Symmetry: C6
Subunit: 90 residues, 6 copies
């Protein structure tokens, strides 16, 4: 019953924006937000159906890797508290 | 009895994976995140000593597949009350 | 048609030079700056695809004489509305 | 007449929290606070009787060194303006 | 009709303050402000007549280089939108 | 006559030791601290040129036993009024 969670972390904001844009191409994936965490790292987070999020994060990481470095790509299909409990800030 | 668990990662994504696993792996409450620079993020949980011990281990393990884990530690009973010592 | 342009620099001064040149070099609106740590600064502009393409090229070029350029990129049409995807 | 001042600086928050916890074991030592200063550095600060603070900072640094790196341990026995003048924020 | 824009970027705040002080020696140069951008980098910005700003930034960089590292010195003689449009915060 | 003194350290603790010593070592007022990233902290004092000169020397010396000192400098008379040039 929980939406899935998708992350793409990049070094560089531009890569993260490219990532985000690509991830939201598919209209069933909502962009939760960015998170700066220092030393140029930016984490783009998206919510949605497991398969969509899977496809989106892959698409996002792919888009991003042509613009700057990609430090992580990960999907959490069934978050264990509410998405909001486990996230810090949209 | 009641305790504090930490997993510190380089990368937010690793920390989120850590957090999710820690909640999944035992009856522990997720206190929260803390950014401290250069991509380091500290996930913190409260709960029963054994649960927290199991959760932090599970969290660090999950996390290590996503990014780097810089620390894993449990404080089995904090010397001011369990959250007094946290800054958050 | 309508688009997004980015020039990321190490150094604020390089980013300001970049911004100034981007505005000079075509009919493009300067959205703004974003600091993301360790001296990295991302200048962002909106406008017509070709203008933004020309501006980002001009901006990166200007900037490279002042400090390091870490990225130059154009998103010719952003998939939420042009500013929806930006955090600023 | 001034309380003494104790510092333990660590790379890593977890080390600093361990440090703080250990330092406050002794009920005559008050924890002033944490200070993040970048690149993972965190400074734990405590106030109290000179001897207590001496003992606490030593205990804290010790606790901490098993969890992450310790970058400084220092005691200022008699601060020269008020503790509050010389500190930035609790 | 636009004022010119002068920048001196330093690693170290002390260098930047020395830079700023030197730049404002000449009464026809207004100090816009500082900007921290991470990893010890600080950007001092000044506004004024093209020649003054030219002279000031040179003087500032010079002063600064004896105190810490100078990462950039640059003058934009005729900013293309208003100075305020192209700047982030005084 | 009236002046500005700076000691920049890597580490807050070194900066606090520096500050304490600077106040101890002469008739100088402590303006304040400034964090600027990667553990760098700049302690600033105002006062009589000679006092500030003596204090900054004393401060840097104290500090060097605790952590790294990145800069020591005195501006004997600031060209806008003594605090105008500071950002704090």
């Amino acid at each position: 019953q929980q939406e899935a969670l998708g992350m793409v972390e990049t070094k560089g904001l531009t890569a993260a924006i490219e990532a985000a844009d690509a991830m939201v191409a598919s209209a069933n994936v909502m962009l939760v937000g960015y998170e700066k965490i220092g030393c140029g790292l930016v984490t783009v987070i998206v919510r949605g159906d497991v398969g969509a999020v899977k496809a989106a994060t892959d698409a996002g990481a792919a888009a991003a890797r042509n613009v700057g470095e990609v430090k992580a790509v990960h999907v959490i299909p069934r978050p264990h508290t509410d998405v909001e409990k486990i996230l810090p800030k949209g």
